[PDB]
Amino acid sequence: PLEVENYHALYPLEPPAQPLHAKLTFPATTYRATHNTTGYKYCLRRIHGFRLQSTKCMTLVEMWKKLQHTNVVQLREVFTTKAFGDNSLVLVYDYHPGSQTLLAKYFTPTSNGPLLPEATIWSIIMQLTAGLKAIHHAGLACKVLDPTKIIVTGKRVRFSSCCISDITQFDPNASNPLALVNMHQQDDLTALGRLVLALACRCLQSVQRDNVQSSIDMVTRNYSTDLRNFIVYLFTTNNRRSVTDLMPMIGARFYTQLDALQSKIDMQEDELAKEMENGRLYRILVKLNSINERPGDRYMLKLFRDYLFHSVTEDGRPWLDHAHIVQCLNKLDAGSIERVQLMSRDEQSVLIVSYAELKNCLENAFSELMSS
Amino acid sequence: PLEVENYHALYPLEPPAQPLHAKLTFPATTYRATHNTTGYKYCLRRIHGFRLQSTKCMTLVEMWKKLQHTNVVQLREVFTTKAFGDNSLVLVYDYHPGSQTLLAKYFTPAPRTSNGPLLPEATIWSIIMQLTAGLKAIHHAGLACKVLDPTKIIVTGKRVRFSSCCISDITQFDPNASNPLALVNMHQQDDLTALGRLVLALACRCLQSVQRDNVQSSIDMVTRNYSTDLRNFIVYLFTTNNRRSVTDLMPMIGARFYTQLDALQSKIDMQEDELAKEMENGRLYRILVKLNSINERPDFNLDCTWSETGDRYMLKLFRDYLFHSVTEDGRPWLDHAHIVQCLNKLDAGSIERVQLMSRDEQSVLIVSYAELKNCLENAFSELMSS
Ligand SMILES: Nc1ncnc2c1ncn2[C@@H]1O[C@H](COP(=O)(O)OP(N)(=O)O)[C@@H](O)[C@H]1O
Numbered sequence: 001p002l003e004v005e006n007y008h009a010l011y012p013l014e015p016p017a018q019p020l021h022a023k024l025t026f027p028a029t030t031y032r033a034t035h036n037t038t039g040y041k042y043c044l045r046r047i048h049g050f051r052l053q054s055t056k057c058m059t060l061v062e063m064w065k066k067l068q069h070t071n072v073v074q075l076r077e078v079f080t081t082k083a084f085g086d087n088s089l090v091l092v093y094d095y096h097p098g099s100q101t102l103l104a105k106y107f108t109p110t111s112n113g114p115l116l117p118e119a120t121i122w123s124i125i126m127q128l129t130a131g132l133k134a135i136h137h138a139g140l141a142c143k144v145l146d147p148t149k150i151i152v153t154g155k156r157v158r159f160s161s162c163c164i165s166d167i168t169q170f171d172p173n174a175s176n177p178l179a180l181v182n183m184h185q186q187d188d189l190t191a192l193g194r195l196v197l198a199l200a201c202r203c204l205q206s207v208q209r210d211n212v213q214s215s216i217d218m219v220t221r222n223y224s225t226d227l228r229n230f231i232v233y234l235f236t237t238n239n240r241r242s243v244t245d246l247m248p249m250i251g252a253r254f255y256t257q258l259d260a261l262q263s264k265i266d267m268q269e270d271e272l273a274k275e276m277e278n279g280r281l282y283r284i285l286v287k288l289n290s291i292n293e294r295p296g297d298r299y300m301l302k303l304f305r306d307y308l309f310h311s312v313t314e315d316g317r318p319w320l321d322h323a324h325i326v327q328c329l330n331k332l333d334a335g336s337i338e339r340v341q342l343m344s345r346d347e348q349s350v351l352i353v354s355y356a357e358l359k360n361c362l363e364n365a366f367s368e369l370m371s372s
Numbered sequence: 373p374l375e376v377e378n379y380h381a382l383y384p385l386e387p388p389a390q391p392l393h394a395k396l397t398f399p400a401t402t403y404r405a406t407h408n409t410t411g412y413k414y415c416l417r418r419i420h421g422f423r424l425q426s427t428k429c430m431t432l433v434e435m436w437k438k439l440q441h442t443n444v445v446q447l448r449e450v451f452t453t454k455a456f457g458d459n460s461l462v463l464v465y466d467y468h469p470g471s472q473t474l475l476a477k478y479f480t481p482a483p484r485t486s487n488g489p490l491l492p493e494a495t496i497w498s499i500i501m502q503l504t505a506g507l508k509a510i511h512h513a514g515l516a517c518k519v520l521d522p523t524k525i526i527v528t529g530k531r532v533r534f535s536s537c538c539i540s541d542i543t544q545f546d547p548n549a550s551n552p553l554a555l556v557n558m559h560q561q562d563d564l565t566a567l568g569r570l571v572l573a574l575a576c577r578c579l580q581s582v583q584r585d586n587v588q589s590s591i592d593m594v595t596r597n598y599s600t601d602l603r604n605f606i607v608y609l610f611t612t613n614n615r616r617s618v619t620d621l622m623p624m625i626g627a628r629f630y631t632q633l634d635a636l637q638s639k640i641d642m643q644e645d646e647l648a649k650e651m652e653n654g655r656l657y658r659i660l661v662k663l664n665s666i667n668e669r670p671d672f673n674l675d676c677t678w679s680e681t682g683d684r685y686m687l688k689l690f691r692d693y694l695f696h697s698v699t700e701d702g703r704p705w706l707d708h709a710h711i712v713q714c715l716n717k718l719d720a721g722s723i724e725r726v727q728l729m730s731r732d733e734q735s736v737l738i739v740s741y742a743e744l745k746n747c748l749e750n751a752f753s754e755l756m757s758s
């Protein structure tokens with residue numbers, strides 16, 4: 001299995017994907033792949049020997065593809081295929097690199113590992129809550145919510161494979177569908193509460209039906225009263241629950257998170273401003289190379305091309321400076337007033353040109369070439 | 373005036389700084405400056421004909437310096453100098469480029485049509501979420517914006533900032549008072565009021581809607597065309613008998629936080645993309661430089677090298693494959709995307725093979741990219757050693 005219909009270059013993720021419970025476990029596996037047309041790297045998940053029962057399910061998927069939230073791993077497309085040798089349904093998601101499952105992050109062996117700092121638990125709470133708000137608004141339920149089902153790429157938290165579980169369990173013909181999405185949506189909120197308690201305890205089996213109440217008691221000792229009420233709110237099942245209702249409990253923290261994100265944006269704003277250089281170089285040289293090969297002005301650029309890479313040390317040895325080439329190209333891109341002296345292969349001719357002028361020669365030459 | 377205290381190549385920002393009213397208007401100009409030691413570019417404000425009275429205001433300037441928030445333009449230093457040709461006090465801020473005042477952005481007219489199509493509500497909240505973020509940061513540090521209004525806020529791309537918060541305190545600062553900072557709380561309330569006017573003015577997008585006479589109906593304007601949350605927001609700020617807090621405004625913004633919190637994360641996503649492509653650009657620019665050194669470099673590099681043979685020739689053919697493509701019309705087809713795909717294949721050195729065709733139709737040459745990379749590597753090292 002090296003080819004799939006709309007993709008190729010598949011690579012197996014680890015750990016191997018868990019087999020999924022429909023009624024009978026359908027062995028299922030998730031893969032790194034590469035798009036055939038663009039060469040983009042995506043993530044695709046195969047569930048073995050599965051065919052969608054009705055077309056209506058397709059409507060449900062369309063909702064899933066349609067949804068777009070930063071806190072949800074994007075669903076890109078879904079197709080049924082026989083290429084693997086067991087005809088199967090594969091879902092393609094965006095591939096987020098170096099990500100590990102939240103289970104992997106925090107529950108792998110103050111218990112197993114130093115109990116999570118409160119600060120972190122809220123940042124998680126805000127991301128997960130945001131995703132849920134987006135999902136529920138979009139008239140969907142996560143369906144399954146638990147440590148394996150959420151992935152953390154760097155500091156970001158994302159609902160990794162939410163659509164799958166909904167697809168597998170869906171009824172094409174359902175008595176009150178919208179009434180059922182309602183119970184499902186609530187379930188998530190109960191499941192959200194169960195998750196965060198596992199986090200605050202940083203022991204997965206704290207959530208145990210038996211254990212939970214003492215686990216809650218622990219939470220309040222080591223963490224704030226707010227985090228308590230939050231967790232206690234999600235657990236009081238009797239009442240209808242909303243992502244909105246959690247809002248005053250997170251409370252003013254939103255400003256800390258909102259504020260943090262802006263300085264991350266300012267962080268990368270600087271980085272990006274520096275590394276933007278690489279781009280200009282790649283592009284400026286690409287214009288120049290295309291110009292040099294294809295056929296006065298053309299000769300001028302060609303002499304300049306010799307200036308950069310045709311160099312010879314007094315002896316006859318080459319003089320390739322990497323740094324010099326970068327400087328000259330940057331000056332060329334800037335179109336600086338400063339002038340360089342070009343020498344023709346003939347001894348007599350010598351050319352004096354401003355970079356700004358030379359940049360024009362390239363700019364003029366390219367446009368005509370594109371035009372033709 | 374081309375040299376300053378720490379500063380040279382000062383450039384005049386437009387539109388020109390508005391005069392500053394303390395008692396008698398002091399003409400002012402704001403400048404783009406380059407730091408001499410650092411070469412970093414800052415923004416500095418000169419208010420004309422001034423002398424600081426005392427260290428007392430300085431102790432206050434220290435606090436502004438301590439403070440550092442994303443929604444406020446940073447204060448770096450304040451100094452009094454006689455260089456510009458008179459007595460002036462100059463304040464140095466971080467320079468945010470291409471930024472414009474909030475007044476200029478939303479209130480410049482081209483005509484309820486107002487002067488412009490009423491602002492989208494979503495837009496207004498994001499502004500609210502950023503200004504409130506600013507005051508929350510500033511009060512919490514025991515300060516009052518002192519002046520809040522369309523001119524004093526600048527918008528740099530999507531980012532909204534308090535442009536020159538510190539200036540108001542030093543200019544109006546007095547040697548003798550009940551205390552310098554005894555007054556700060558009434559200032560803070562004055563801010564929260566001033567916030568209300570700004571957002572009301574934005575809703576209407578008519579600047580004069582703030583005026584005493586007009587307000588009630590301006591609020592009436594808001595309620596017709598916007599959410600009743602925005603109504604409550606503007607209205608809450610206007611009750612004056614009550615002591616108030618920036619963080620009291622929270623439930624009114626309410627569920628928007630996810631909305632904003634989300635757009636920022638998507639901005640973070642977009643940058644990681646951009647940041648990624650730049651590194652690729654990095655990888656490939658360098659591959660290209662190695663490619664260029666070799667082609668036609670081999671003028672006399674080797675005596676024995678025979679025409680059209682082995683490594684030098686194979687890389688020449690590859691160069692033609694990238695930059696010497698003809699559209700069926702016979703037009704030069706330069707493919708930007710194609711070139712990037714090929715170089716990545718060469719940089720990665722993939723299993724997959726490509727067909728390199730001579731200018732002669734007869735000659736054709738099929739080579740794996742991994743083999744294709746090897747030629748460049750071996751060709752380059754041979755050249756590097758000399
Ligand atoms: N959408 C995704 N993009 C990139 N990597 C992903 C991903 N979803 C999951 N992964 C990676 O694969 C591992 C398990 O993912 P997956 O097989 O889909 O979830 P599972 N069956 O273990 O519950 C995780 O450690 C995670 O790093």
Ligand SMILES: Nc1ncnc2c1ncn2[C@@H]1O[C@H](COP(=O)(O)OP(N)(=O)O)[C@@H](O)[C@H]1O
Nearest residue numbers: 385387389390402415445467468471472473523
């Ligand atoms: N801190 C700052 N960094 C970069 N640019 C700034 C800035 N403060 C103001 N500007 C720009 O300079 C112009 C005038 O600045 P400013 O002096 O704040 O306006 P003013 N004095 O008439 O009230 C504005 O159009 C604004 O875009």
